[PDB]
């Protein structure tokens, strides 16, 4: 909070919370390790799986919109 290194843009290939690339082929696996899959959101974003994790740990919700995502369970119930 109140420090920002001019880094303020919104993305669809890249996780915000670490700005690190984001993105996987249909058929090929970008990324070795499935801890950081794509994780898609029910709102429609994005997230590396851990860092989406990481994040939810501490506010169980979108850092881009600010949605009230599921629960760190993973599957909210009522
Ligand atoms: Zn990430
Ligand atoms: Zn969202």
Redesign the pocket.
């Known amino acids: 909070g109140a420090e920002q290194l001019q880094n303020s843009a919104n993305d669809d290939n890249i996780?915000?919370?670490?700005?690190?690339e984001?993105i996987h082929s249909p058929n090929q696996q970008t990324w070795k390790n499935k801890n950081?899959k794509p994780k898609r959101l029910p709102c429609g974003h994005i997230?590396?799986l851990?860092?989406?994790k990481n994040w939810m740990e501490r506010s169980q919700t979108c850092p881009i919109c600010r949605l009230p995502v599921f629960d760190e369970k993973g599957n909210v119930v009522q």
Do not use: N, R, V, Y
């Not at 996780?15 to 690190?20: A, E, F, N, V, Y």
């Open positions: 996780c915000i919370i670490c700005m690190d984001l950081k997230l590396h851990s860092c989406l």
